[PDB]
Amino acid sequence: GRLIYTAGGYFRQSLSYLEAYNPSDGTWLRLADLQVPRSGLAGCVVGGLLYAVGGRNNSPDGNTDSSALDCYNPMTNQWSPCAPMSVPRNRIGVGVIDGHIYAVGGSHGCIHHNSVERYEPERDEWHLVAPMLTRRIGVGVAVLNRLLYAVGGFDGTNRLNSAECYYPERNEWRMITAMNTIRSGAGVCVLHNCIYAAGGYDGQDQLNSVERYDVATATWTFVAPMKHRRSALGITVHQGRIYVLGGYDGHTFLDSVECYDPDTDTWSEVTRMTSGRSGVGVAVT
């Protein structure tokens, strides 16, 4: 029985919450708080351990961009610090290949990163890899066919509909087919050999539209839209279904959790988080 973990987020200020949802019984578990509050972070799992990567601590009295990597062990209910990244990365994108964490783009003050780094848990080390062709903050990251895709985001001037792909063996990036919609702060995941891009911000409105990339045809196709428009939403895949958590709709910090069934092409509200928030880190273990 795997759980959907939600770490950090934002409501008035950056949060420390670590909560886990059980889709089987609909229950929420209140787990050990993050040591440092963060929003704009990303979550991932390697060998049953949860990782909270980058982000920013937004407090009423000041902001602190994060280069931190923290590891949560569900068996001990304890957070442990890891080696930090080379640079702080707020609005980061994260992906896992062969038990290695890829930290993609994000921001540090005025800097919009195109840089990409990789973490080796067995050595507790980060190393820079080939940078992206585009500077991307609020980037969605997905792993498919042992390739790392970086989708949408913001380059510092414009919000992007463009997407690119990383080849770990060759250590190089190549541009792929651009999405139908400009999306920054969208939820990006992989389900049944397809990349999904849900919600985000186009420059004028928070989106409820969802589009899917098919590798064989190299095309992006719209699927059923979500019930709620949302930007800076958390996203994950659990037992063949997509789960979207919170985000900002332009008025409210959502507590809404929607579930997408690819067999019926339908979204349904499954639960509510304990409180509304945006910019959470999400993973399943």
């Binding site: 704009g40 913001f154 911000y201 930007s231």
Partner: peptide, 7 residues
């Protein structure tokens, strides 16, 4: 403080 994140 922005439309994308609500910060």
């Amino acid at each position: 403080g922005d439309e994308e994140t609500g910060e």
